Paper text:
Here we utilized a tandem repeat of three TelSAM domains instead of two. In order to avoid aggregation by rapid self-assembly of the resulting construct, we selected the N-terminal domain of the ferric uptake regulator (FUR) protein from E. coli. A flexible linker was used to connect the n-FUR domain to TTT, in order to allow the n-FUR domain to sample many orientations and select a favorable position without restricting the orientation of the 2-fold axis. We determined the structure of the TTT-FUR fusion protein to 2.3 Å by X-ray crystallography. One molecule was found in the asymmetric unit, and all four protein domains (3 TelSAM domains, and 1 n-FUR domain) were identified by molecular replacement using Phaser. The loops that link these domains were disordered and not visible in the electron density. The identification of this mutation allowed us to place this molecule first in the sequence in accordance with the design, with the V80E TelSAM first in sequence, followed by two WT TelSAM molecules, and ending with the n-FUR domain. The organization of the 3TelSAM portion of the fusion achieved the expected structure, an oligomer with 180° degree rotation per unit that forms a 21 screw axis, which can also be described as one dimensional crystals or fibers. The 2-D layer is formed by TelSAM fibers that are interdigitated with the n-FUR domain. Importantly, within this 2-D lattice, the n-FUR domain is the sole contributor to the lateral contacts that connect the TelSAM oligomeric fibers.
Numbering used by the authors:
A (entry chain A), B (entry chain A): 11 to 87, 98 to 174, 183 to 258, 271 to 351
């Protein structure tokens, strides 16, 4: 029992950006609210539907909770461009940029500059909602919610950097920055961005990361926060294979200090010496199934002389 | 009852490229075949399994049928890099190139030069098996079969060019070439590649297309061959909507010579004059559902004054 004009009585999914603005103006007068600036929700009705109640309160502290609930009352009676149908973990930097361009058209947002998110989908997924708001004051909340919706519809370090950040040296910090530039497709990260060790890097606030690095500081800080939060029978199961005696034994021989690298025939000869009763072609099949399941690597040599190496 | 050595008695899926070669040499001697050059199948066993019987006969006219059937006798007792999980219709030119690089690693092929297929996935899908062989004498048949397998696991012209090729002028031929360069991501197609009309273009063999255009002639010829081969109740159904009287009428008013572009209120007023009994908010909802279903386009104007245009 709230009377909107005819073109606002349809489903909000249909409301243009002007319809959104006429709705706000209608509500302000209907409910004696504080003035609602015509710029408070620069989007269409489809975009407004993606916003959380918290996003309403954030855009309109005087009236947002009220507008959200007015919207639920009104309600009580997504396919992307071809290259973007992948899980966002796989979007390239170019994809992210095409995602922005699609989104700005789909949702009538204010112009999203093409350097707003210069990073790949993996990096995008590291950012917080706060970081989307910061990069995009007009549309960051819609964009973040857009992404969460795309996720409903559906990172390990280099070896030289797998020790706690607290022990990193200046040099490690430097290798981290250039590892992260490549992994996350970020703008160039000049070698002097963070001239310090891990202990000092751990003292910086996210605002320090942003100042040192306008293009990538938020990604880098959340990467750091991520990094800080993050029996042969089972060995076989864990790699996808049924336990058999021929598998256990061969696996056993490969775990000998001498037999890490071993060819099929030597493995066989080694099995016999131990008094095991296993056939030659069986040794070949096991080690190749082991290869396929990541337990060993086959290194080829002509005529049944490949050497198998336990990974 | 064919006795291979131990490492060739495993499943062919496991055979390296050398194992393939030792198998051929074994077969040649076991079956008194003509000499089989060690270069006849430069691939691993996984690749050999993708080849058709026809590919066997083509690689070995003296012995291929025989090798294929030996292989079926032996048998009688695919996940791509992340960016390539899309239907191949969507692969970019860069994807195609990454597809080649993955394939050459996966299958131990001879080196596939990165300019072997300079075109996008749509273009790749136009090529015949013969064109894959021509572009890649060592691996083209495997690659084509690889693609068919990826498809089991799962183009309209610009308006100025939708008339039969037989009527194309020189100028049209020229617009076709640059439309196709953009659509298929081909190398630059110099304006002098085909200085002639559609009737003459239709006289050229595929070999003429290849000579005029080493980078793209086969794509262009198959594009040409593709092009040459290729009631309101139903109007509503065809666009995804249940027939209702309010829909039929509005659709009817929009098909008037005067009302192609019409706003909701005028449509309403026009319905009344005809003695129709339909409410104003209903006119709004229909035209917006029509918009969403491609029957009209909504052109926005502030305050319920959008003009709707029949597409």
């Amino acid at each position: 029992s709230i009377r909107l004009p005819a073109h606002l009585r349809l489903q909000p999914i249909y409301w243009s950006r002007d319809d959104v603005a006429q709705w706000l103006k209608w509500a302000e007068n209907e409910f004696s609210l504080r003035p609602i600036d015509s710029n408070t929700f620069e989007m269409n009705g489809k975009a407004l539907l993606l916003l959380t109640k918290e996003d309403f309160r954030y855009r309109s502290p005087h009236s947002g909770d009220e507008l959200y609930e007015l919207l639920q009352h009104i309600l009580k009676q997504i396919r992307l461009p071809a290259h973007l149908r992948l899980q966002p973990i796989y979007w390239s930097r170019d994809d992210v940029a095409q995602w922005l361009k699609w989104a700005e058209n789909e949702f009538s947002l204010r112009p999203i500059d093409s350097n707003t998110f210069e990073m790949n989908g993996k990096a995008l997924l590291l950012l917080t909602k706060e970081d989307f708001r910061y990069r995009s004051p007009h549309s960051g909340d819609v964009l973040y919610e857009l992404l969460q919706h795309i996720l409903k519809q559906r990172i390990r370090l280099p070896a030289h950097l797998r020790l706690q950040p607290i022990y990193w040296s200046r040099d490690d910090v430097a290798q981290w920055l250039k590892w992260a530039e490549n992994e996350f497709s970020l703008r160039p990260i000049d070698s002097n961005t963070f001239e310090m060790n891990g202990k000092a890097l751990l003292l910086l606030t996210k605002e320090d990361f942003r100042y040192r690095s306008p293009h990538s500081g938020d990604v880098l800080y959340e990467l750091l926060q991520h990094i800080l939060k993050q029996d042969n029978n089972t060995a076989l199961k864990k790699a996808g294979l049924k336990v058999t005696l021929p598998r256990l034994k061969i696996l056993e021989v490969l775990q000998e200090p001498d037999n890490h690298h071993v060819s099929a025939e030597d493995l066989y000869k080694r099995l016999i010496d131990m008094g095991e009763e296993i056939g030659l072609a069986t040794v070949y099949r096991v080690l190749n199934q082991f290869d396929d399941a990541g337990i060993v690597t086959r290194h080829n040599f002509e005529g049944g002389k490949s050497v198998f190496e336990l990974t």
